Every structure is written in structure tokens, then in C-alpha cells.
């Protein structure tokens, strides 16, 4: 069995003609995506703008949008470059559905576990790490990352910013593991930084969730 070598001009044949097809990614395009990027999961894109909650409704503010298995969609909302320290705090952002959809008021019913990450607020390059994990989680749910996860959430406030991670469940043990990974994403260092909220408490906002590093 040969390996990455290519020491012969036989395996390849330098010759083409009317080469059918013609893909064009947003990378090589820059202004003409001739190809639609699909995935193997489902995830909506809701962005909350808490402000009229005074008397409106958590459901009256939340703005649900992009709900597909692509990337050009969710990426747009990112184009907003709001990040966890680039947009009006006290905000929220949740993308998911692979398992449920409703929200922290039901999605929990799905994941069962809410892994949040409280941050005093920094503003450097965390939006890339927080995403790399989320984007991969929804975009790469096939396995390894979002093996069986349910969805992710976002919530900014005065303190600074707080991102939530919802997991189908598959046992919390494996979660404490996942969270740890998200921990570094928070750009911390021994500070523990992490939040564990059991769905059972998420909906009924019951006191004493799980933990908060």
C-alpha cells in the first residue's frame, strides 16, 4: 500500500476538456458564491435584543432567523461583529435545533444540561474561540464535537458576557469534560470560569443548578 508520495506521472493524467461542473466557494469567490454550502444538521439562529422586556415578552424580543444547514447564514449574523464584547450587552443569541428548538424554556427539555461561561469582560479575540467551538458544534455536529449535543446559547450582560452550551445530555460526566474545553475558550487560566445549569432548573429557574467556576 503506497502512501503520500506521488513518485510517478501515471497516477495522474495531465489532460482535460469541457471539464463539467464548476464550484465557487465564498473564499475563492469574494463576490459570487456559485455553490451552496449544506450540512447534516438543523439549527435556527435567534438573536435577543433585551430592551423592551420591561413589559414586552422574552418571545416578543427574541429575533429568530437563519435556520439552515449552511454557513453563509449564521456567518452573516456574525458579520454584525457584535461578539461577546462588541455589541450592546444584556443581549442573547441562541442557535440550535439538531435535537430540539423551543429555547432555554424547552430546549433544556432536550439537552438537559446548560453549560454557561461567565466572563468579567475582556475584549480581545474571544469571539473567535467562543465561535470556533459553537460554529464547529453546529457545523460539525456529525461527531467528535457535537457528537449528540442539542444546541448552544449566548447571553451578554453588565459583568461582560456569558455563553451557554446545551448538550443533549449523554451524561453530565462527558459534559464536565466538554465544558473544560469551553473553559479555555473563555480565555481563562485556572480561574475555573464555567457554569452548569440543569434543565430541570433552567425552565423553573430553580435555585442551586450544578456549579459555577
Amino acid at each position: 500500500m503506497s502512501v503520500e508520495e506521488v513518485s510517478k506521472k501515471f497516477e495522474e493524467n495531465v489532460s482535460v476538456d469541457d471539464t463539467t461542473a464548476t464550484p465557487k466557494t465564498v473564499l475563492s469567490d469574494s463576490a459570487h458564491f456559485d455553490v451552496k454550502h449544506p450540512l447534516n444538521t438543523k439549527w435556527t439562529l435567534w438573536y435577543t435584543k433585551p430592551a423592551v422586556d420591561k413589559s414586552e415578552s422574552w418571545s416578543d424580543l427574541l429575533r429568530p432567523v437563519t435556520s439552515f444547514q449552511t454557513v453563509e447564514e449564521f456567518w452573516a449574523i456574525i458579520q454584525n461583529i457584535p461578539e461577546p464584547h462588541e455589541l450592546p450587552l444584556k443581549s442573547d443569541y441562541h442557535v440550535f435545533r439538531n435535537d430540539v428548538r423551543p429555547e432555554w424554556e424547552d430546549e433544556a427539555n432536550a439537552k438537559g444540561g446548560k453549560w454557561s461561561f461567565q466572563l468579567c469582560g475582556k475584549g480581545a479575540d474571544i469571539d473567535e474561540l467562543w465561535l470556533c467551538t459553537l460554529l464547529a458544534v453546529i457545523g460539525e455536529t456529525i461527531d467528535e464535537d457535537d457528537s449528540q449535543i442539542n444546541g448552544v446559547v449566548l447571553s451578554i450582560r453588565k459583568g461582560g458576557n456569558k455563553f451557554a452550551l446545551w448538550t443533549k445530555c449523554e451524561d453530565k460526566e462527558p459534559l464536565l469534560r466538554i465544558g473544560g474545553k469551553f473553559k479555555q475558550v473563555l480565555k481563562l487560566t485556572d480561574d475555573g470560569h464555567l457554569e452548569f445549569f440543569p434543565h430541570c432548573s433552567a425552565n423553573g429557574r430553580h435555585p442551586q443548578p450544578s456549579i459555577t467556576l
Binding site: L27, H32, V35, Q79, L131, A136
Partner: protein, 100 residues
């Protein structure tokens, strides 16, 4: 030595907008685009390329590298929401098979 014009230009253009990306503009590109074979199914020629990046995630099928998706963000600069339903509803998905 030289019989004619050795200098011949071929499709140069390379000049669209002042560098501003618009949802309608890009989404409009989709209106007349081709299908997809899958991330690793298509090698993006432009200082980038996703061959096995996430393909190692196990089972692949539809795994878009973390860094890859990032690149998208660079050219995605287009706060959408409306045109989305217009284009997003068009986004096509094709199962990576062919062979067996």
C-alpha cells in the same frame, strides 16, 4: 523576433464595488449559482482549501473546519435577515456519495 502584440489580456475585470459586501449582492449571486458536492467535496482555490480538515472528525459527511468557516466570515460581511429567506430558502444540500 516579434510579429504582433505579445501582450494579450484575458478577462481581467477584477473590480467590483468599493469593497462593500451587501446581502442582496451576494445572495443575488446564489440566484444563479451551482450546487455543492460538500466542503471537502470542493477545493477552494484562494490561499485556502479544506481537504481533510474536519474530515477526520469521524463520519465526516458535513464537517466544516473551524478555521474554514472563519474564512467565510471574512467574505460573509453582509448583515442579512431579509434576503436570507429569499436566498437561504435556496441553499441546496447534496449527499457526498458518487463512488459507492
Amino acid at each position: 523576433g516579434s510579429i504582433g502584440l505579445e501582450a494579450e489580456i484575458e478577462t481581467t475585470t477584477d473590480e467590483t464595488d468599493d469593497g462593500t459586501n451587501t446581502v442582496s449582492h451576494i445572495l443575488n449571486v446564489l440566484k444563479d449559482a451551482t450546487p455543492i458536492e460538500d466542503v471537502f467535496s470542493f477545493n477552494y482555490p484562494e490561499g485556502i482549501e479544506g481537504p481533510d480538515i474536519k474530515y477526520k472528525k469521524e463520519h465526516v459527511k458535513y464537517t466544516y473546519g473551524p478555521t474554514f468557516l472563519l474564512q467565510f466570515k471574512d467574505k460573509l460581511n453582509v448583515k442579512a435577515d431579509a434576503e436570507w429567506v429569499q436566498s437561504t430558502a435556496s441553499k441546496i444540500v447534496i449527499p457526498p456519495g458518487m463512488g459507492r
